[PDB]
Amino acid sequence: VEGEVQIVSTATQTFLATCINGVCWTVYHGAGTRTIASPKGPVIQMYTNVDQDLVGWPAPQGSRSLTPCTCGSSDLYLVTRHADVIPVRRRGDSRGSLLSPRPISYLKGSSGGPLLCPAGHAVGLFRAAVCTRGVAKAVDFIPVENLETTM
Amino acid sequence: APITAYAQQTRGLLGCIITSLTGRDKNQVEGEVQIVSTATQTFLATCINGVCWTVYHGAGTRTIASPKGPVIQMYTNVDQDLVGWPAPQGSRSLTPCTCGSSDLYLVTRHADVIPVRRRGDSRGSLLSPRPISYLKGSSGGPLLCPAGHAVGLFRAAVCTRGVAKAVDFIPVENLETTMRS
Amino acid sequence: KGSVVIVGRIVLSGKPAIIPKK
Amino acid sequence: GSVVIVGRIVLSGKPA
Ligand SMILES: *[C@@](=O)([C]([C][C]1[C][C][C]1)[N]C(=O)[C]1[C]2[C]([C]N1C(=O)[C]([N]C(=O)OC([C])([C])[C])[C]1[C][C][C][C][C]1)C2([C])[C])C([N])=O
Ligand SMILES: [Zn+2]
Ligand SMILES: [Zn+2]
């Protein structure tokens, strides 16, 4: 069994990474320019896009890639580091609103995770939660196109 | 909840043949879609409302191997191109779509779910065309609406130059009509 | 002719899961 | 300091 989502961590914190099209993507604000660990030693990033807050390394072992979305649906689903699925309504190119706001703690550690469409295809990567008084009602995300373009 | 799927091979070539002849399959069943085979070909069979349905052009008039020996088909409709046997003990059934959605998702034998736009009662176009080799073996598989309900069963590919741009399917309506006849 | 034989299955009811480590 | 993989998630729920 291979996973599309890797639960990763630095010395500072924990977050997620998603394998899309042979690349393991995550948030630059979490990984920075760090290398990813492997049994043969540290492997460097293939893509570093500080502006789009995106970094990518070659997909690791035990992983399988996710297919980018091509049906253009607005009914998204955020997957958390706890494997929780959260339906999100796409509000824009890189924004979406949770159908049921959740405490920020619930979305904690999921940046880098995938935003999926009704077919389980990648719509984008969870960039940051947009909260009001500790309640996440929306989320920022990196559209798959950005990834597709960076490659 | 998005549509995700996974496949698991439960039997090999030689075990398949023996089972085909004996008609006695002792393997445990799990799932909504069964990967099925005859000495001739391999395709899919979908369980909807307690009945395991597939394409007549695949199963023909054959029995399905079960733990109690061969099981005769409950429904056969050469015209609707459908056949159905009682769903295997252990399987899980899908339920017909009621939301009338036109955005469907075809589940292939490789457990991939691909988007198709409904262009009529029995047709839908692939948002992303794939070579027909990719769709090979998926006849009898389900076309699901965004909520995961059976809208139809994959029947044939609409291709040219070896690439499928649309799919022809048997709407879940023909199933009820078939059970009624 | 021979019977139709189940040689595999496709499961749609599975939800995202953290792969247990063995 | 490298980013280390501490776990994995399978979207389909595929067991084993
Ligand atoms: C199914 O039984 C297969 C799955 C297809 C997708 C590529 C292989 N279905 C068929 O073989 C059907 C059966 C036979 C002809 N079929 C086709 O899919 C053919 N298309 C077709 O007839 O299209 C129209 C115009 C009627 C919509 C293709 C054509 C290209 C070469 C391959 C066959 C019919 C319709 C009874 C399985 N075993 O996986
Ligand atoms: Zn999609
Ligand atoms: Zn529906």
CATH architecture label name of the largest domain in chain A: Beta Barrel
How far do the termini of chain C sit from each other?
Answer: 44 Å
Number of strands of chain C: 2
Radius of gyration of chain C: 15 Å
SSE arrangement of chain C, N to C: EE
Indicate the overall shape of chain A: globular
Largest sheet of chain C: none
Shape of chain C: elongated
Q: How far do the termini of chain A sit from each other?
A: 27 Å
Q: What is the percentage of strand-forming residues of chain C?
A: 35-45%
- Annotated CATH topology of the largest domain in chain A: Thrombin, subunit H
- Secondary structure category of chain C: mainly beta
Question: Which secondary structure elements does this structure contain, and how are they paired or packed?
Answer:
The complex is a heterotetramer, with two copies of chain A and two copies of chain C.
Chain A: E1 5-9, E2 14-20, E3 23-27, H1 28-31, E4 47-49, E5 54-58, E6 75-79, E7 85-92, E8 95-103, H2 104-107, E9 114-116, E10 122-132, E11 135-143, H3 144-150
Chain C: E1 5-11, E2 17-18
Bound molecules: ligand HU1 and zinc ion (2 copies).
Protein name (chain D): Genome polyprotein
Organism (chain D): Hepatitis C virus genotype 1b
Subcellular location (chain D): Host cell membrane; Host cytoplasm, Host perinuclear region; Host endoplasmic reticulum membrane; Host lipid droplet
Structure, described:
The complex is a heterotetramer, with 2 copies of chain A and 2 copies of chain C. With 151 residues, chain A is mainly beta. In chain A, 10% of the residues lie in helices and 46% in strands. Chain A is globular, with a radius of gyration of 14 Å. Chain C has 22 residues and is mostly beta strands. Helices cover 0% and strands 41% of the residues of chain C. Chain C has no helices and 2 strands. The chains are: A mainly beta (151), C mainly beta (22). Chains in contact: A-B, A-C, A-D, B-C, B-D, C-D. The interface between B and C is medium-sized, with 50 and 16 residues. Strand 2 (33-37) of chain B pairs antiparallel with strand 1 (5-11) of chain C. Bound molecules: ligand HU1 and zinc ion (2 copies). One zinc ion (ZN) binds at residues 69-71, 73, 117, 119, 121 of chain A. One zinc ion binds at residues 97-99, 101, 145, 147, 149 of chain B.
